[PDB]
Design a protein around this ligand. Sequence first.
Ligand SMILES: [Zn+2]
Ligand SMILES: [Zn+2]
Length: 53
Amino acid sequence: GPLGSEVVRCICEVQEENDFMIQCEECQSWQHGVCMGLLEENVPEKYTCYVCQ
Ligand SMILES: [Zn+2]
Ligand SMILES: [Zn+2]
């Protein structure tokens, strides 16, 4: 994001993407779905990350 904020900002603090990334509706950064306790089939349309929820 602006001011060079990290696009991948997950609780695991790993920047590398995997096969299932999800974008927070509030802060607009991305997390690994598995870190957020989610699966492809249960991530909601209005997903909010660990920081923002
Ligand atoms: Zn993660
Ligand atoms: Zn967020």
